[PDB]
């Protein structure tokens, strides 16, 4: 992919927009990257639960590297629109604009393909209950003294 | 003499026994029969207690 870092991102972001894209006449505004990089370090932060939300591959910066900016996000190819679909969206109200509908519609439909394999994953049956017999049938496990699951 | 019959070659049956060994430590050693529940063979681990104290 040519979008490799938080930079790509936020000049994605904000070309989307319209802020500063060379489609207009504006170029990207020092100030305006690190209040962006900013905001997607939040969205990721509030996306990915710690663990227990949407996992992107997404990597936090550290205080001991300089600029925030220049880090490769390590997204995988498969969320780099919607990451930066969302954070266009997100960081549309600074500036007192609003994202259209495509953009909005763009954002959902990414999160959704971003979480549809982690809910494939996470949809995991539970075991049997320890009060279940194994039934005759199972043999090894009767012959064994397994007549019930272990549940747990 | 110069008796120039058919010649053949003759196998017998009755083997040369040669080997003859005894296994004197796994006859004193238990053999056990472990409790498992599923036919799977990932980590066959069977854990027993100890005696207290």
């Known amino acids: ?152 | 003499a110069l008796n120039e019959g058919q010649i053949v070659t003759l196998a017998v049956d009755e083997i040369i026994e040669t080997i003859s060994a005894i296994t004197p430590m796994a006859q004193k050693a238990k053999k056990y029969t472990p409790p498992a529940a599923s036919m799977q063979r990932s980590s066959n681990t069977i854990w027993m207690p100890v005696e207290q104290e």
């Open chain 1, 1 to 152: 992919m040519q979008i490799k870092t938080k930079g790509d991102l936020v000049r994605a972001a904000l070309r989307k927009l319209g802020v500063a894209s060379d489609a207009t006449l504006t170029d990207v505004e020092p100030q305006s990257m690190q209040d962006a990089v900013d905001d997607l370090e939040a969205m990721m932060a509030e996306w990915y639960q710690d663990g227990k939300g949407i996992i992107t591959g997404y990597v936090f910066s550290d205080d001991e590297n300089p600029p925030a900016e220049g880090d490769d996000h390590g997204l995988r190819s498969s969320a780099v629109s919607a990451v930066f679909h969302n954070l266009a969206c997100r960081i549309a109200p600074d500036y007192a604009l609003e994202a259209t509908a495509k953009i909005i519609a763009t954002a959902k439909y990414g999160k959704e393909l971003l979480y549809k394999q982690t809910a494939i994953s996470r949809a995991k049956r539970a075991p049997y209950p320890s009060r279940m017999p194994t039934g005759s049938g199972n043999s090894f496990a009767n012959l064994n003294e397994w007549h019930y699951f272990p549940g747990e």
